[PDB]
Design a protein around this ligand. Structure first.
Ligand SMILES: CC(C)COC[C@H](CN(Cc1ccccc1)c1ccccc1)N1CCCC1
Ligand SMILES: [Ca+2]
Lengths: 17, 89
């Protein structure tokens, strides 16, 4: 039941600023 | 052979891939190549709203650890995703 979407969270900028 | 997966891996488009590849930059965001471990796992999970332990995490690698490597390369990883999604239990 790997929602997957949850990952997008860990890959949302990852402190790019 | 693992062909049943090939097709599946072929189904995925650059789209689902990207979003995925991204997560690939977190699991092995501190690995030499692209092998994931129980230490790295918790790293991602924590960023996914989950905070597991190193005892229950190992169970994540174990499965993918078919070669007894101790970690999760870039192969077994994606597979483990298609194993449940297209065959969960
Ligand atoms: C389905 C959930 C209850 C837990 O599943 C997460 C991991 C898969 N991940 C990748 C992943 C992590 C977080 C969010 C989405 C996907 C995994 C991959 C390689 C090594 C360890 C874990 N496996 C354990 C059971 C089968 C799948
Ligand atoms: Ca392995």
């Amino acid at each position: 039941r790997i929602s997957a979407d949850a990952m997008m969270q860990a890959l949302l900028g990852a402190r790019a600023k | 052979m693992d062909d049943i997966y090939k097709a599946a891996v072929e189904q995925l488009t650059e789209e689902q891939k990207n979003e995925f590849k991204a997560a690939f930059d977190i699991f092995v965001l501190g690995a030499e190549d692209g092998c994931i471990s129980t230490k790295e796992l918790g790293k991602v999970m924590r960023m996914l709203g989950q905070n597991p332990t190193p005892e229950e995490l190992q169970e994540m690698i174990d499965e993918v650890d078919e070669d007894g490597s101790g970690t999760v390369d870039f192969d077994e990883f994606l597979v483990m995703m298609v194993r449940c999604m297209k065959d969960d239990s």
